[PDB]
């Protein structure tokens, strides 16, 4: 069975789209160890697809349990695909999460929502390297198509993946964290873990069993990259994401 993770910003009509895809059969439980709601449901028109609703989140930071829930699920690789619900009226701000979702290594399909409620869909698709489909609940179009696209854009079907490329200086840091990580992380999510370690993410630092050597190399890399920017590590990433998004939205 194909498991499509539904994730987006709050107020993107994500919970609206979930209900319109799954119909009446909705199974709700609880995530392990936390009080965070676990919503799920099979696709109304295709019962062979289970849609896993994730809570509406703006980022994948170590500060929120909802954001931890979303992250941990995507790194456990229980999801085949990501169906990223994106509010078109606030494209730049919604794409902050998207860039992070793409880095996890689970193929992303974007349901570009609230088209009715101008963007060239194909150019946005091309510069993010992900399938994008305009979805309008009002016109009742592309909802079935975007599900189908996510359904066959999975960890199984897709070979290589396009990740957002940042400044050469940060890419230098990322590849040097990638070299020192070795096989301590999966190839699929390696880049995701490398950026989090650069940011000095509490969850990732504590999650990975890293040798004294690896931890010391990551430090040197952070120290030098912080000096060349004259900016703290976390901020460097934040600015890079927005810069990439602005470059992408220009298109």
Automatic annotation (TrEMBL):
Residues annotated for GDP binding in this entry: 11-16, 29, 113-114, 116, 137-138
Domain FeoB-type G: from-to ranges: 1-156
Binding site for GTP: 8-15, 33-37, 53-56, 113-116
Localization annotation: Cell inner membrane; Cell membrane
Annotated binding of Mg(2+) 2, by residue: 15, 19, 23, 35, 53
Residues annotated for Mg(2+) 3 binding in this entry: 120, 122
UniProt: Mg(2+) 1 binding residues: 15, 22, 35
Chain's role: Probable transporter of a GTP-driven Fe(2+) uptake system.
The family this protein is said to belong to: Belongs to the TRAFAC class TrmE-Era-EngA-EngB-Septin-like GTPase superfamily. FeoB GTPase (TC 9.A.8) family.
Record-given protein name: Ferrous iron transport protein B
From-to range in the entire protein, with total length: 1 to 257 of 712
